[PDB]
Amino acid sequence: QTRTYDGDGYKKRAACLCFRSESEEEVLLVSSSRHPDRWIVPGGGMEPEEEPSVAAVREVCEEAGVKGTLGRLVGIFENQERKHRTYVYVLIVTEVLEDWEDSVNIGRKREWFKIEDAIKVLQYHKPVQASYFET
Ligand SMILES: O=C(N[C@@H]1[C@@H](OP(=O)(O)O)[C@H](OP(=O)(O)O)[C@H](OP(=O)(O)O)[C@H](OP(=O)(O)O)[C@H]1OP(=O)(O)O)C(F)(F)P(=O)(O)O
């Protein structure tokens, strides 16, 4: 996959907060490839000329094996340490697929979390991802 960058050299990413329902009480996290006992928000790099909302949906299909109704842009989040900029969308999950690309290819796991518990497991390694939930 070709990595893309903003004019200031930050890597362009898109991600979804993948909720079980329109009540947005439970969210899907996925395991880190580099560190499988860590949870992250599914998302990843935008391809050349790829709209952020398209990249967001593609990446959560690839990583989390879900599909659903794309909701609002929550915001654009910089990670100054890692020099990336992430567009973060709400996705209401309508389809949970059992044998998805990163499960098959790299053994990636997924799990539902209550919002408060998602914030807790992201805080240590992924504080910017915890902040996606601050509304
Ligand atoms: O390696 C790092 N983060 C990498 C992602 O790993 P995690 O964010 O899951 O820890 C990795 O995601 P996976 O391949 O593990 O799913 C992918 O992030 P992305 O593909 O979601 O963007 C990759 O980016 P690439 O190297 O561009 O693939 C990221 O590295 P940085 O983009 O340098 O943070 C890190 F920042 F150095 P760490 O301190 O988290 O180890």
Author numbering: 8 to 142
Please quote the paper that reports this structure.
Inositol pyrophosphates (PP−IPs) are densely phosphorylated messenger molecules involved in numerous biological processes. To investigate the function and regulation by PP−IPs in biological contexts, metabolically stable analogs have been developed. Co‐crystallization with the proteins DIPP1 and PPIP5K2 enabled us to scrutinize similarities and disparities of all analogs, as compared to 5PP−IP5. The DIPP1 phosphatase has a flexible ligand binding domain whereas the PPIP5K kinase domain displays higher ligand specificity.
